Design a binder for this molecule. Structure first.
Ligand SMILES: CCCCCCCCCCCCCCCCCC(=O)OC[C@H](COP(=O)([O-])OCC(O)COP(=O)([O-])OC[C@@H](COC(=O)CCCCCCCCCCCCCCCCC)OC(=O)CCCCCCCCCCCCCCCCC)OC(=O)CCCCCCCCCCCCCCCCC
Ligand SMILES: Cc1cc2nc3c(=O)[nH]c(=O)nc-3n(C[C@H](O)[C@H](O)[C@H](O)COP(=O)(O)O)c2cc1C
Ligand code: SF4
Lengths: 215, 56
């Protein structure tokens, strides 16, 4: 990566131990963070590795729009990483291992925040549509299954499906994950998995509303 | 059966049992030849998940 080679000469010039001072063990160094979405001041900033997410948002980003209680979800490492809700991001650290403990992973340290005034299903569907557009399509799992997941999410957004399909979608993701050639299939399966795992009630409520209103 | 009462009495006495109760010719008591559409429920393995074929 650009950042790795860019920091290598400064590491050599100032020594390995100086870099190893920051962060935790096996998570040493400083990291560039992009904060985007629903914040007062979206920005890029270099910060110590294992900085808590909350103070990172409240210090450099200016805080979530409408206050911290307005926060709904955060994607800590770009579209590939699964989302996490407010409850776990209250007291989570920002590095590889502590985010893996939160079943997400650091990824590329790209924080995207969403407050309570947005359609999270719409956002995850947009991400799945992006992954559908950007897959090369040489291997059957990524190509076929990612188009299938894109269609299923598009159907979820308006609530046109039934709850028995949600688990099916989960199964579909597990068929894509680990069976493709590269990690794009994994990075398309993970957001669906996180959305389902953390907001199944939202999808179920949307399905009930659609079924009631269409009869 | 459109049989006169005297003939019914004669046949019942000859047989020894009441024939008119259970006749061997079928009448309007049978089911209609045109029926409503059925629905025919699906089997147990018509699930959408946790239905891998290697397990069944
Ligand atoms: C013995 C004398 C014959 C009398 C007789 O047979 O009457 C049958 C008459 C009818 O009995 P049934 O067979 O139970 O009734 C059948 C239907 O009612 C039958 O009713 P239907 O609506 O079919 O009408 C058909 C009609 C006309 O049907 C015909 O065309 C055949 C008649 C040609 C006869 C030659 O039959 C008759 O009226 C003539 C009957 C025979 C008389 C000759 O029975 C009696 O009158 C009792 C007589 C006791 C005998 C033991
Ligand atoms: C679909 C996909 C897109 C990727 N895009 C980038 C990218 O734009 N920049 C990058 O540094 N790594 C990207 N990666 C990860 C690369 O595998 C990674 O850069 C490579 O392993 C070397 O990264 P490193 O410097 O961390 O060792 C991407 C991976 C996948 C699966
Ligand atoms: S998983 Fe990778 S190699 Fe396979 S179709 Fe998707 S982008 Fe291409």
């Amino acid at each position: 990566n650009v950042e790795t080679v860019a920091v290598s000469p400064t590491i050599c010039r100032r020594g390995g131990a100086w870099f190893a001072s920051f962060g935790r063990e096996r998570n040493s160094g400083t990291k560039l963070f992009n904060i985007s979405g629903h914040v007062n001041h979206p920005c890029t900033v270099e910060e110590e590795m294992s900085v808590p997410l909350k103070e990172l948002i409240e210090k450099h980003a200016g805080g979530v729009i409408g206050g911290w209680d307005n926060l709904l979800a955060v994607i800590p490492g770009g579209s590939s990483t699964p989302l996490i809700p407010k409850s776990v991001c209250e007291t989570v650290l920002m590095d590889f291992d502590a985010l893996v403990q939160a079943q997400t992973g650091l990824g590329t340290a790209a924080v995207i925040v969403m407050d309570r005034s947005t359609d999270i299903v719409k956002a995850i569907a947009r991400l799945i549509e992006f992954y559908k557009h950007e897959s090369c399509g040489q291997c059957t799992p990524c190509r076929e299954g990612v188009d299938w997941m894109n269609k299923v999410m598009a159907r979820f957004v308006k609530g046109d499906a039934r709850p028995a399909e949600i688990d099916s979608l989960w199964e579909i993701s597990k068929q894509i994950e680990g069976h493709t050639i590269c990690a794009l299939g994994d990075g398309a399966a993970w957001p669906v998995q996180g959305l389902i795992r953390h907001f199944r009630p939202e999808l179920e409520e949307r399905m009930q509303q659609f079924a009631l209103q269409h009869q | 059966a459109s049989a006169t009462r005297v003939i019914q009495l004669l046949r019942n006495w000859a047989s020894g049992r009441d024939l008119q109760a259970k006749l061997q010719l079928r009448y309007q008591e049978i089911s209609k030849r045109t029926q409503p559409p059925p629905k025919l429920p699906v089997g147990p393995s018509h699930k959408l998940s946790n239905n891998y074929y290697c397990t069944r």
